[PDB]
Design a protein around this ligand. Structure first.
Ligand SMILES: CCCCCCCCCCCCO[C@@H]1O[C@H](CO)[C@@H](O[C@H]2O[C@H](CO)[C@@H](O)[C@H](O)[C@H]2O)[C@H](O)[C@H]1O
Ligand SMILES: CCCCCCCCCCCCO[C@@H]1O[C@H](CO)[C@@H](O[C@H]2O[C@H](CO)[C@@H](O)[C@H](O)[C@H]2O)[C@H](O)[C@H]1O
Ligand SMILES: CCCCCCCCCCCCO[C@@H]1O[C@H](CO)[C@@H](O[C@H]2O[C@H](CO)[C@@H](O)[C@H](O)[C@H]2O)[C@H](O)[C@H]1O
Ligand SMILES: CCCCCCCCCCCCO[C@@H]1O[C@H](CO)[C@@H](O[C@H]2O[C@H](CO)[C@@H](O)[C@H](O)[C@H]2O)[C@H](O)[C@H]1O
Ligand SMILES: CCCCCCCCCC
Ligand SMILES: CCCCCCCC
Ligand SMILES: CCCCCCCC
Ligand SMILES: CCCCCC
Lengths: 1044, 48
C-alpha cells in the first residue's frame, strides 16, 4: 500500500477525508452518556389502598400479587414494602441484558391474574407497572414569582397541565408529583350528619346519584320510524363542576318539607387528593416533578425532550408561574465529556509544538499532527459501527490512544528523516526505503499490542462493560493508526517533507534550533558512550533491575484498589427520616433547619435547595423528607473544602445535632447499582411463619451481636421502621346484630370518615378529577372523636360507635418488608477500616447462624453480585503475557529474544505506582488502563530497538555490541519525541480542576509517572536486556563481529 | 417420622417451597401434586 499511495497522494487524502467525514457524522448521531449501562433492569409494581394500615396492605394486596409472580424470565430477586400510608411497592430485579420491555410485559401478564383479587378501592386508585431507574434524573421545580398562587394551587396546576405530557415523553420511566392534584373535597361533620340522621353512606350514595354522567340516547335515533325529521342527542345529568354544585346535592327532604343539602353536613372545597407532600424552593412555596429515566434510555436525549416539552407549556402559564431547575444530573455529563474533548484538542496542540521542536519545519510537524485527528475521527465511526456510545470511558480511550497514534506517525516520519540524513536520498525515494524497513514492524506491533488491550474486553460482570469501552476504543484506534501509517503518512512524507542533505543534522542553523540541534547531536554521543559503558558492565544492572521489580511489587501491594472515583457532579441530596409516629409539622421543623443551614452556612457553595416534606426514598410518610441541593458552578467552588465530599461531610456533622431525627447529606456514587464500595445489603428472612414480632427479636439479637465486633463491622443497622402505637377497635358483632346496625355501614362510616373514600369523578375546568369524602380534620384527631360518629340502624335509630365497639392501644408495624415473597428485614452495614467486604460478610453469616430456629438470611443488591466472585485480573493478564510472548516470538522467529522486550514492562509500572502513591490515588479503572497504555508504548519502543539491532546483526553482519549501540542510537530521538509529546499531552489532565477532574487527574498522573520512568529507564535497560538475552540463549558463534 | 399426613406435606410444599421454585432460574411452570390448605367449612344441611 505505501508504494501505491506514495505515487497517489490525492487518493491517500481522499481516504483520509472520507474517514473523517464518517467520523464527524458518527459524532453528530452517536448517543452521549456518562457510562455504558450496567444497572440490572428493575420493574416496579405500585398500588395504593387509601386509609389502609401496613398489615392490611400486605395481606390484602402485596401477598396476593407476590404469589402470582412466577415463570418470569431472568428474575434475580423480588422485594416489597407495604406501609401504613396505604402504599405497596413491589420491585422485580432482572439479570443485566434483560430486555426491559419484555420483563415489563411478563410482569404485567402475571399481575393481571392478581388484579381481580384485589380490593375494588385498590383497583380504582390505579395500579402501575414501571420500568425505570430508582434515582431521579432531574427535578423540575415550579414556583410563582408574584406570590399569587399557593403551594396547593401550583401543585394542582402542575398536575393538571404539565405532568401528563411529561409522563408520556419517551425515556421518562416514572414521574413523581411533589404535591397533589386537586380533588373535590367533601369534609363531613359528624354532628350535623347525626342531627339529620344521616351517615357517610347516605353522603356517598347521594354523590354517586347526583354527580353522574348518564347515557340517554337520541330523539329520532336508529332504527327510526318512517318519516322522521328530528335527530338530536338527549342530554341528561352531567358531572358536577364546582363546589357550589356539590353543595346543593340534595341529601333528603325533612318531614316538614325543609331541605337537607350536602353543604348542611359538610364543608366543600377544592383540595388535594392527598395532603402528604409539600415542597419549597429556597424557602418559598413550590411544586415540581421528580423524573426518573426509563430503563436503558439515554439520559441526555430524554432531558432534551423534557425541556422541549416544558418550553411548549411556558407561554400558557398563569401570571408569575415559573419553572426552576433545582436538581439535574445531566449537565455534569455534558460538561465532563466536553472537558475531555478540550484535553484532546489541547493534547494535539502540544503534540504539534513538540514535533516542531524536533522537526523544525511547519510542513513536517503537520504530518504526525494530521494523522491523529484522522485516526480519532475514524475511531468514532468504528464505535458507531459496533453500537458504542460516546461516554467517559470511550473519551479517555481516545486520549490514551493519542500516545499510540502519534508514535505511529513519528516512527514513520522520523525514520524517513534519518534516512534523508544518512544518505541524502530525496524525499520520495527515502520514504519508500523507509516504509520498506519498518512497515513490517508497525503491523506486527499492532498485533502484540492488541494482545495487551483485548484481554480486558473479557472481564466479567458489571466490571467488564467498563473495561470493554476502553479495549474496543483503543484497539480500533490502533488498527486505524496502522492503516493511516500505511496510506496517508507515506504519501504525506513523500510530498511535504524537506530534502535533507547527506550528513546534515541542523547544526548549520542559527538561533535556537541550531543550538538545540547541536546539543542533541552531542547529548546523543553521550547517550551511546554511556550504554557502551553499561554493556561492558552489566551484572550490576540486572541487580538494579531486581531492585526496581521488588520495589514495584512493594508499591503495588500497598496501593489500595478502588473502581471509579466519586465526582463532584454539582448536586447532592439530604435525607430526613424521623421516627414513625412523628408529625408532618415536626418533619417540617427539621426540614427548615436543613434548608436554613444550606441557605446561611453554605452561601458561597449552594445555589438552591428544593425540599420536600412527606416524600423520601420510602417513599411517602409524615415522618420523612428530602432536600435536593444544587451547587454553584465548579469554577466558583475552588478548593477541596468547597467540593461535594467536604460540603456533605460538614453538613452531616452539623445535622447530627438535630434531635430525634436521622438527617444526612451524601454524594451519589459513580454507579449506585455498584453502591458503597464497602457496604453490604443483608436480608433477614422469616423462613417458618414466625411472624413480625419474632423476626424483630431475631433482628435485634443480630444487631446486638454485630455491635460487639467493631473490629470488623461498622454501622450495622436496619433499613426500615420501628413499630409504633396503633389504635385497635373491635366491632362487637352481637351488639351490632342486636341493634340492627349493618357491618357494612359500620365499616364504611369508620373508613370514609377516618381514612377518606374516593367516591367518583368530576370535571374541574375541563379536566376529569376525583371526588373524596372524609371527616373534616377536627373530628378525626382524637380517640374520643370515635364515639361522635353515628350509624343509622335498620329501625331508623342513630347509634354511636361507642355502643358497639371497644378499643385499646397496641403496637404494630408502619412498614412491612418482604424479600422473595417471605417476610424480611433489610440490614445495612459496612466493613470496619482495614477489613474486607468479604470478611464482614463472612462474619454476618456466622452471627446469622446463631439466630433462632426458622430465621434465615440472604444477600441482595450490591452484596448480591458479588459471588459472582472477584479477581480475574491475574488469569487474564497471565494469558495477555503469554499471547504477547507468542506474538513476539513469531515477530523475531525466536523463543528467547522476546524476553528482551518483555522485561521492560516493570519500568513503566514503577513510575505509575510512584506517582499514584504520591498523589494519594488508588488502583482503579483509570490507573489500570493508563498503565496498559504506558506498557504498550514502552513495549513498542523496545520492539523497534531490538528489531534494529537484530536486523543489523542479521542483514548487515554487525556484531552484538556494535549493533545494539547503533540500534539504540538510531532510536533515541523517536523515543524522546513520543515520550515528551505524550507526557505534555496528558499534563492538562493531571492539572485539571473542575467537572470530572477526579477522572482526569486519575488518568493523567499514572500515565505521566509511567511514561517518565518508562522513557528514562528503558533507553538504558533495553540494550542490557538484549545483549544479556542474546548471550544466555546463543550457541557458540560469536559474539564478534563476523560477516557476511 | 410419622408426623405429617399427605395433605400436611402438600400444604407445606404449596406454602413454603412452590413459589420460590417457580421463581427459580430456568423454571417455566410448576405443577403441585396435591393441594395447599384452605379453611374448609363443611356444612350440614340438617343443622342449617
Ligand atoms: C489550547 C486550547 C484549549 C481549548 C480548546 C477548545 C477546543 C474545543 C472545545 C469544545 C468543547 C467544550 O469546551 C469547553 O467546554 C466546557 C463546558 O461548558 C467549558 O469549560 C468550563 O469553563 C469553566 C471552568 O473551566 C466551567 O466551570 C464551565 O462549566 C465550563 O464553561 C469551556 O468554556 C469550553 O471551552
Ligand atoms: C481532533 C478530532 C477528534 C476529536 C473530536 C471529538 C468530539 C467529541 C464530541 C462529543 C460530544 C458531542 O455531542 C453531540 O454534538 C452534536 C453537535 O451539535 C449534537 O448534534 C446536534 O447539533 C447539530 C446542529 O448544531 C445537529 O446536526 C444535530 O441534529 C443535533 O443533534 C449532538 O446531539 C450531541 O450529542
Ligand atoms: C489464527 C489465529 C491467530 C493468528 C496468529 C497470530 C499472529 C501473530 C504475529 C505477530 C507478529 C508478526 O510479525 C511479522 O513477523 C514476520 C517474521 O519476522 C515479519 O516478516 C518480516 O520480518 C522477518 C524477520 O526480520 C523477515 O524474515 C521477513 O521476510 C519479513 O517479511 C513481518 O514483517 C512481521 O509483521
Ligand atoms: C505483558 C503485558 C500486560 C501485563 C499486565 C499489566 C497490568 C497490571 C495492572 C492490572 C490491575 C491489577 O489490579 C487488580 O485489579 C483487580 C480488579 O481489576 C482488583 O480486584 C479487587 O477489586 C475489585 C473491585 O472492582 C474486585 O472486583 C476484586 O474481586 C478485588 O479482588 C485487585 O484488587 C487489583 O490487584
Ligand atoms: C480537508 C483537507 C484537504 C487537504 C488537502 C491536501 C492538499 C495536498 C495536495 C497534495
Ligand atoms: C512462556 C515461556 C516460554 C519459554 C521459552 C523458552 C525458550 C527457550
Ligand atoms: C506456550 C508455550 C511456548 C513454549 C515454547 C517452547 C519453545 C522451545
Ligand atoms: C474527586 C474530585 C472531585 C472534584 C471534581 C470537581
Amino acid at each position: 500500500m505505501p508504494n501505491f499511495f506514495i505515487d497517489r497522494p490525492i487518493f491517500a487524502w481522499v481516504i483520509a477525508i472520507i474517514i473523517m467525514l464518517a467520523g464527524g457524522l458518527a459524532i453528530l448521531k452517536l448517543p452521549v452518556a456518562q457510562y455504558p449501562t450496567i444497572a440490572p433492569p428493575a420493574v416496579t409494581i405500585s398500588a395504593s389502598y387509601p386509609g389502609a394500615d401496613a398489615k392490611t396492605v400486605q395481606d390484602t394486596v402485596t401477598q396476593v400479587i407476590e404469589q402470582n409472580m412466577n415463570g418470569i424470565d431472568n428474575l434475580m430477586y423480588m422485594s416489597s414494602n407495604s406501609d401504613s400510608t396505604g402504599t405497596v411497592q413491589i420491585t422485580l430485579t432482572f439479570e443485566s441484558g434483560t430486555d426491559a420491555d419484555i420483563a415489563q410485559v411478563q410482569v404485567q401478564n402475571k399481575l393481571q391474574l392478581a388484579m381481580p383479587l384485589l380490593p375494588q378501592e385498590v383497583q380504582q386508585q390505579g395500579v402501575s407497572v414501571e420500568k425505570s431507574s430508582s434515582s431521579f434524573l432531574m427535578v423540575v421545580g415550579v414556583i410563582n414569582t408574584d406570590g399569587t398562587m399557593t403551594q396547593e394551587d401550583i401543585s394542582d396546576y402542575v398536575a393538571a397541565n404539565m405532568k401528563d405530557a411529561i409522563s408520556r415523553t419517551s425515556g421518562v420511566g416514572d414521574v413523581q408529583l411533589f404535591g397533589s392534584q386537586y380533588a373535590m373535597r367533601i369534609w363531613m361533620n359528624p354532628n350535623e350528619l347525626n342531627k339529620f340522621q344521616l351517615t357517610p353512606v347516605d353522603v356517598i350514595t347521594a354523590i354517586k346519584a347526583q354527580n353522574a354522567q348518564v347515557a340517554a340516547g337520541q330523539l329520532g335515533g336508529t332504527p327510526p320510524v318512517k318519516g322522521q325529521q328530528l335527530n338530536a342527542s338527549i342530554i341528561a345529568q352531567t358531572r358536577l363542576t364546582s363546589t357550589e354544585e356539590f353543595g346543593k346535592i340534595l341529601l333528603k327532604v325533612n318531614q316538614d318539607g325543609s331541605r337537607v343539602l350536602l353543604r348542611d353536613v359538610a364543608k366543600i372545597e377544592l383540595g388535594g387528593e392527598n395532603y402528604d407532600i409539600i415542597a419549597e424552593f429556597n424557602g418559598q412555596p413550590a411544586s415540581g416533578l421528580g423524573i426518573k429515566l426509563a430503563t436503558g434510555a439515554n439520559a441526555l436525549d430524554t432531558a432534551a425532550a423534557i425541556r422541549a416539552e416544558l418550553a411548549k407549556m411556558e407561554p400558557f402559564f398563569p401570571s408569575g408561574l415559573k419553572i426552576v431547575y433545582p436538581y439535574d444530573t445531566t449537565p455534569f455529563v455534558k460538561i465532563s465529556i466536553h472537558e475531555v474533548v478540550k484535553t484532546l484538542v489541547e493534547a494535539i496542540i502540544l503534540v504539534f509544538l513538540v514535533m516542531y521542536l524536533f522537526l523544525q519545519n511547519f510542513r513536517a510537524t503537520l504530518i504526525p499532527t494530521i494523522a491523529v485527528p484522522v485516526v480519532l475521527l475514524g475511531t468514532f465511526a468504528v464505535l458507531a459501527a459496533f453500537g458504542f456510545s460516546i461516554n467517559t470511558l470511550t473519551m479517555f480511550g481516545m486520549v490514551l490512544a493519542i500516545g499510540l497514534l502519534v508514535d505511529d506517525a513519528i516512527v514513520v516520519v522520523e525514520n524517513v528523516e534519518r534516512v534523508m540524513a544518512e544518505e541524502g536520498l530525496p524525499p520520495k525515494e527515502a520514504t519508500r526505503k523507509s516504509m520498506g524497513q519498518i512497515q513490517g514492524a508497525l503491523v506486527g506491533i499492532a498485533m502484540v499490542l492488541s494482545a495487551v488491550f483485548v484481554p480486558m474486553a473479557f472481564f466479567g460482570g458489571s466490571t467488564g462493560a467498563i473495561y470493554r469501552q476502553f479495549s474496543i476504543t483503543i484497539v480500533s484506534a490502533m488498527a486505524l493508526s496502522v492503516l493511516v501509517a500505511l496510506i496517508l503518512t507515506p504519501a504525506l512524507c513523500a510530498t511535504m517533507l524537506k530534502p535533507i542533505a547527506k550528513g546534515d543534522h541542523g547544526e548549520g542553523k542559527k538561533g535556537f534550533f541550531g543550538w538545540f540541534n547541536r546539543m542533541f547531536e552531542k547529548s546523543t554521543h553521550h547517550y551511546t558512550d554511556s550504554v557502551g559503558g553499561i554493556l561492558r558492565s552489566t551484572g550490576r544492572y540486572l541487580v538494579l533491575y531486581l531492585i526496581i521489580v521488588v520495589g514495584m511489587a512493594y508499591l503495588f501491594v500497598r496501593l489500595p484498589s478502588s473502581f471509579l472515583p466519586d465526582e463532584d457532579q454539582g448536586v447532592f441530596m439530604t435525607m430526613v427520616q424521623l421516627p414513625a409516629g412523628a408529625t408532618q409539622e415536626r418533619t417540617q421543623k427539621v426540614l427548615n433547619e436543613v434548608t436554613h443551614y444550606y441557605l446561611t452556612k453554605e452561601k458561597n457553595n449552594v445555589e438552591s435547595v428544593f425540599a420536600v416534606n412527606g416524600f423520601g426514598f420510602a417513599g411517602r410518610g409524615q415522618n420523612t423528607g428530602i432536600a435536593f441541593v444544587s451547587l454553584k458552578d465548579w469554577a466558583d467552588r475552588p478548593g477541596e473544602e468547597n467540593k461535594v465530599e467536604a460540603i456533605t461531610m460538614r453538613a452531616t456533622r452539623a445535622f447530627s445535632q438535630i434531635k430525634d431525627a436521622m438527617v444526612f447529606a451524601f454524594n451519589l456514587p459513580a454507579i449506585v447499582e455498584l453502591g458503597t464500595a464497602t457496604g453490604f445489603d443483608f436480608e433477614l428472612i422469616d423462613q417458618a411463619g414466625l411472624g413480625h414480632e419474632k423476626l424483630t427479636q431475631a433482628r435485634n439479637q443480630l444487631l446486638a451481636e454485630a455491635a460487639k465486633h467493631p473490629d470488623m463491622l461498622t454501622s450495622v443497622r436496619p433499613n426500615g421502621l420501628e413499630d409504633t402505637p396503633q389504635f385497635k377497635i373491635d366491632i362487637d358483632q352481637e351488639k351490632a346484630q342486636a341493634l340492627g346496625v349493618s357491618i357494612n355501614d359500620i365499616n364504611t362510616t369508620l373508613g370514609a370518615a377516618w381514612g377518606g373514600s374516593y367516591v367518583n369523578d368530576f370535571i374541574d375546568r375541563g379536566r376529569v378529577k376525583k371526588v373524596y369524602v372524609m371527616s373534616e380534620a377536627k373530628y378525626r384527631m382524637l380517640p374520643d372523636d370515635i364515639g361522635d360518629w353515628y350509624v343509622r340502624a335498620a329501625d331508623g335509630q342513630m347509634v354511636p360507635f361507642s355502643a358497639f365497639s371497644s378499643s385499646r392501644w397496641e403496637y404494630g408495624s408502619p412498614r412491612l418488608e418482604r424479600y422473595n415473597g417471605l417476610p424480611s428485614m433489610e440490614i445495612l452495614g459496612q466493613a470496619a477500616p482495614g477489613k474486607s467486604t468479604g470478611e464482614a460478610m463472612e462474619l454476618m453469616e456466622q452471627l446469622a447462624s446463631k439466630l433462632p430456629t426458622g430465621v434465615g438470611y440472604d444477600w441482595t443488591g450490591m452484596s448480591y453480585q458479588e459471588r459472582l466472585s472477584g479477581n480475574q485480573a491475574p488469569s487474564l493478564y497471565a494469558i495477555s503475557l503469554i499471547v504477547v510472548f507468542l506474538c513476539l516470538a513469531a515477530l523475531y522467529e525466536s523463543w528467547s529474544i522476546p524476553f528482551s522486550v518483555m522485561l521492560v514492562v516493570p519500568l513503566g509500572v514503577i513510575g505509575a505506582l510512584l506517582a499514584a502513591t504520591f498523589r494519594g490515588l488508588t488502583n482503579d479503572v483509570y490507573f489500570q488502563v493508563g498503565l496498559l497504555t504506558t506498557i504498550g508504548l514502552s513495549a513498542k519502543n523496545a520492539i523497534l530497538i531490538v528489531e534494529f539491532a537484530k536486523d543489523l546483526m542479521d542483514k548487515e553482519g554487525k556484531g552484538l555490541i556494535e549493533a545494539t549501540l547503533d540500534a539504540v542510537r538510531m532510536r533515541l530521538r523517536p523515543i524522546l519525541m513520543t515520550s515528551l509529546a505524550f507526557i505534555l499531552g496528558v499534563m492538562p489532565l493531571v492539572i485539571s480542576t473542575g467537572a470530572g477532574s477526579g477522572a482526569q487527574n486519575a488518568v493523567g498522573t499514572g500515565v505521566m509517572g509511567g511514561m517518565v520512568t518508562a522513557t528514562v529507564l528503558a533507553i538504558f535497560f533495553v540494550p542490557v536486556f538484549f545483549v544479556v538475552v542474546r548471550r544466555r540463549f546463543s550457541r557458540k558463534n560469536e559474539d564478534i563481529e563476523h560477516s557476511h
